[PDB]
Amino acid sequence: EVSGITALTVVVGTVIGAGIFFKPTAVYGAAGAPGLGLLAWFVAGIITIAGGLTVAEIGTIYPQTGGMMIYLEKVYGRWLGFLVGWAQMVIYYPANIAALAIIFATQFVNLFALSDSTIVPTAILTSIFLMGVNFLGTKYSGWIQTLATILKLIPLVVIIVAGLLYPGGGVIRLVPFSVETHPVLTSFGSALIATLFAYDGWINVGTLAGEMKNPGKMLPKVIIGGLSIVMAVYLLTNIAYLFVLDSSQLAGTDTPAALVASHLFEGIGSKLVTIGILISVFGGINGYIISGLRVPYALATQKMLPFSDWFARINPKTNLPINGGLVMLGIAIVMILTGQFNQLTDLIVFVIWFFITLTFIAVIILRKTQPDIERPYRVPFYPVIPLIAIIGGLYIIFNTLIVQPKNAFIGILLTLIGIPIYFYCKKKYG
Amino acid sequence: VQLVESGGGLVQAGGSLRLSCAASGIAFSRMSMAWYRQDPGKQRALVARITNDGSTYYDDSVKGRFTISRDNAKNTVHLQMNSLKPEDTAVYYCNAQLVAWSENYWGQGTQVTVSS
């Protein structure tokens, strides 16, 4: 059980991260106009709210820990549950770590005016250091998590307050909503994906649904309030960015938040805001490392991965399964060496939203195959909100496939590599 | 989920006590059983842990003297505190945790003190 306000804070903390500080580059480089990027943010938030409600329904139906793995295992089959676990193990969490390490290195270089050639070495060093820190037990990781969660709200609030009162802010800063050079149809998909990365992490509402005290009255209010607060914060931050900088200026830099802070609080305030952004990125990497470490243990304890004994090995000193962390760190380093922030974020969004759309279809199927299950929480408008979430997910998947064949091919190839691993592991019993 | 300890008590320095800890209601074979130390007005500090696969970890201050052993047949864990020393006096708890992020199961806690 958890208090209603406590769940609100949990949702706001998990969803909000370092995407808002860096994704505006992609959003306003694709959209190309101040108004279309804001529309992308709003649409992404609406889709996130609908998906959160839909996922929370099944989370209440199946309160067992694990999340999408458990949901898809129970609805479709064990093979798809393992497929979700494997995709999270080899794409989602490694790519999140790689992308956040790359952006941390980029922001660090910008802050300290170092050469751009040190971005990859930095990213690698910080990823290794954070993984090693997480290997020393949950104490330091929890301390970092709490500190980053507390501190990441300060730069956002400061930027919003300062930019909204910038000398020149006004409705004129949000025009013309479209530039002929960027067609609305093609560019809006890329803008939507870029915004959707900033909303990542909302899938934990389903996991928290089972823990919630009294779903069905607090769960809808909690989810709607938390995701609406996240959407409002993102919209206000983007409005502040547009007040301080133009759409072209935001698209022309890899650190929009740093540039806006430099314009707002010249002197030491810009440096402090940049350090806050770096701390937020650090906390994001740490949280992703923890959540990712939790996955290979779950897969191995069910004898679903090769050398499941090795993966499920528990460290006597810290009582942590380290080997899965090492595998994820290796994959993340490989991604860092041969990847980019925007590309990795797009891949993450593509794979996670494919599986999330599968989860929505699972909710719809459960509403039909097993109408008699005890449902503590029912989605508000069954024929409308799940349909909106599924339409959003399908649009994301198809737009990414059409616009980024290489990224979609990479994700599909990794998952299809996972499949024969599943069959071999079933044959050999771990 | 109970964890009943025993074996602690007053002992002369340099003695040897074994702290049995019978665990019931948990998947003992799958759990990593540990022994913690909580000095007065402090927080529990790990003394020794043994994983489900037999791998063991010992605190630097007890390494070479303490020996943690588990026997899944009777669902008990022992801690042979050989060559006790006066600073070793504290209250020793019996823990049973599946994984670092799982729920921690604690015993009633046993008091062991070294007279000399």
Query: If we measure between CA atoms, which residue out of A98, A30, A80, A51 comes closest to residue A334?
Result: A98
> Bridge partners of B24?
B2
- Dmax (CA) of chain A: 68
Q: How far is the first Cα of chain A from the last one, in angstroms, to the nearest whole number? A: 36
Q: CB B57: neighbour CB atoms within 10 A?
A: 19
Measured between alpha carbons, how far is A43 from A358 in angstroms, rounded to an integer?
20
Contact list in A for residue B101 (CB cut-off 8 A) is: 138, 290, 294
If you search the block for the tokens 């938030």, which residue do you land on? Answer: A45
Q: Which residues, including other chains, have CB under 8 Å from residue A386's CB and lie 6 or more apart? A: A50, A54, A360, A363, A364, A379
Resolution (Å) of this entry: 2.9
DSSP string, A103-150: HHHHHHHHHHT--GGGHHHHHHHHHHHHHHHHTT-HHHHHHHHHHHHH
Contact B100 A316 (CB under 8 A): no
Measured between alpha carbons, how far is A322 from A20 in angstroms, rounded to an integer?
31
Q: Which residues, including other chains, have CB under 8 Å from residue A394's CB and lie 6 or more apart? A: A357
Q: CB B6: neighbour CB atoms within 10 A?
A: 15
Handedness of CA A405, A410, A415, A416 (dihedral sign): positive
Side chain identity at A92, as an amino acid letter?
A: Y
Experiment used for this model: cryo-EM
Contact A314 B34 (CB under 8 A): no
Residue B16: φ, ψ to 5°: -145, 115
Query: Cα B103 vs. chain centroid, distance in angstroms?
Result: 17
**Tally of domains in chain A:** 1
Residue of B nearest to A290 (CA): B101
* CATH label of the domain that carries residue A413: 1.20.1740.10
Q: Which residues, including other chains, have CB under 8 Å from residue A188's CB and lie 6 or more apart? A: A30, A31, A36, A39, A40
Query: If we measure between CA atoms, which residue out of A208, A247, A255 comes closest to residue A227?
Result: A208
Residue of B nearest to A142 (CA): B101
- HSE of A50, CA atoms in CB hemisphere, 13 A: 21
Indicate the Cα dihedral angle A346, A348, A349, A351, nearest 10°.
Answer: 120
For residue A379, is it left (φ>0), alpha (ψ between -120 and 50) or beta? beta
Cis before residue A176, ω within 30 degrees of 0? Answer: yes
Q: Which residues, including other chains, have CB under 8 Å from residue A99's CB and lie 6 or more apart? A: A335, A339, A341, A344, A345, A348
If you search the block for the tokens 């609030």, which residue do you land on? Answer: A157
CB A52 within 8 A of CB A227: yes
Measured between alpha carbons, how far is A351 from A24 in angstroms, rounded to an integer?
21
> Bridge partners of B95?
B34, B106
A271 lies within 8 A of chain B by CB: no
Side chain identity at A112, as an amino acid letter?
A: F
Helix (H, G, I), strand (E, B) or coil at A383: coil
Domains and CATH numbers, chain B: 2-114 (2.60.40.10)
Measured between alpha carbons, how far is B69 from B49 in angstroms, rounded to an integer?
9
Contact list in B for residue A320 (CB cut-off 8 A) is: 99-100
B101 lies within 8 A of chain A by CB: yes
Of A138, A313, A315, the CB nearest to B101: A138
A386-390 long-range Cβ contacts below 8 angstroms, 24+ apart: A386/A50, A386/A54, A386/A360, A388/A46, A388/A47, A388/A50, A389/A47, A389/A50, A389/A51, A389/A53, A389/A54, A389/A357, A389/A360, A390/A357, A390/A360, A390/A361, A390/A364
Output the CA angle A295-A296-A299, nearest 5 degrees.
Answer: 90
Side chain identity at A158, as an amino acid letter?
A: V
What distance in Å separates residue B20's CA from the closest CA in chain A?
20
What distance in Å separates residue A325's CA from the closest CA in chain B?
14
Between chain A and chain B, the number of residue pairs with CB atoms below 8 A apart is 36
CB B109 within 8 A of CB B97: no
Residue A174: φ, ψ to 5°: -115, 40
Which residues 37-96 of chain B have a CB within 8 Å of chain A? Answer: 49-53, 55-57
Distances (CA, A) of A26 to A260, B21, B79: 16, 58, 59
> Bridge partners of B38?
B91
- HSE of A425, CA atoms in CB hemisphere, 13 A: 23
Residues spanned by the domain of A50? 4-428
Helix axes A341-369, A184-198, angle to 10 degrees: 80
Measured between alpha carbons, how far is B106 from A394 in angstroms, rounded to an integer?
48
Q: Which residues, including other chains, have CB under 8 Å from residue A5's CB and lie 6 or more apart? A: none
Tokens matching residue A48: 């996130």
DSSP string, A162-186: HHHT-TT-SGGGG--S--TTS-HHH
DSSP string, A29-43: HHS-SHHHHHHHHHH
Measured between alpha carbons, how far is A400 from A189 in angstroms, rounded to an integer?
8
Q: CB A293: neighbour CB atoms within 10 A?
A: 25
Measured between alpha carbons, how far is B52 from B38 in angstroms, rounded to an integer?
24
Distances (CA, A) of A378 to A3, A367, A384, A388, B43: 20, 10, 13, 16, 44
Measured between alpha carbons, how far is A230 from A46 in angstroms, rounded to an integer?
11
Measured between alpha carbons, how far is A23 from A190 in angstroms, rounded to an integer?
11
CB A82 within 8 A of CB A231: no
**What Rg value do the Cα atoms of chain A yield, rounded?**
21
Handedness of CA A389, A395, A398, A399 (dihedral sign): negative
